[PDB]
Amino acid sequence: VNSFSGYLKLTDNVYIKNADIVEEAKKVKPTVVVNAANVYLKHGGGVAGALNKATNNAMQVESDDYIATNGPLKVGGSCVLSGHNLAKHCLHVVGPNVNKGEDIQLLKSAYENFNQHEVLLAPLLSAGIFGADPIHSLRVCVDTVRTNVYLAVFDKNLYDKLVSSFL
Numbered sequence: 001v002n003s004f005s006g007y008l009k010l011t012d013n014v015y016i017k018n019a020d021i022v023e024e025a026k027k028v029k030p031t032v033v034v035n036a037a038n039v040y041l042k043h044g045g046g047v048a049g050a051l052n053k054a055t056n057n058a059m060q061v062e063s064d065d066y067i068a069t070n071g072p073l074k075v076g077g078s079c080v081l082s083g084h085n086l087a088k089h090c091l092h093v094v095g096p097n098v099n100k101g102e103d104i105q106l107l108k109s110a111y112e113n114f115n116q117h118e119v120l121l122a123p124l125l126s127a128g129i130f131g132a133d134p135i136h137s138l139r140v141c142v143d144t145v146r147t148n149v150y151l152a153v154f155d156k157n158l159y160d161k162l163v164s165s166f167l
């Protein structure tokens, strides 16, 4: 049994809700919240900008030290950093950004990072400002992630389309 409330069950392991990932994080304090990161961990906008704002920029300060030591992530890759006031840990995952011309086949590699964590609160990778079709992102999620994932979708409108169209 876990804390997550109000989710629709899509499969054995994937759940979905109309929620902003941050408010949900603040309420649940999950072990892992996933960030929709870029390779530079520059949390300017989208989910990343919202998560970082909710940490009062502490996520960005920590991320800048990570990059100064380790250099950029790979597209499709991830790192585990603090969850600050939102979660125990933040899994920063880099989905391909279609608005930079990155290969959408890297979306499966991105979701494979979730399998290293038994339970996660996450957004749909590569959606919003990364330009991918969220219906496609949900399909790759369901077909890739085997651990228990609670997806938060940032719009009542879109949420309803993902559910209605789910096979």
Ligand SMILES: c1nc(N2CCCC3(CC3)C2)c2cc[nH]c2n1
Pocket: 019, 020, 021, 022, 046, 047, 050, 123, 124, 127, 128, 129, 134, 152, 153, 154, 155, 158
């Ligand atoms: C969950 N998902 C979010 N995304 C923003 C737009 C598109 C998206 C697919 C649903 C991802 C955000 C943004 C801020 N807070 C969020 N929580």
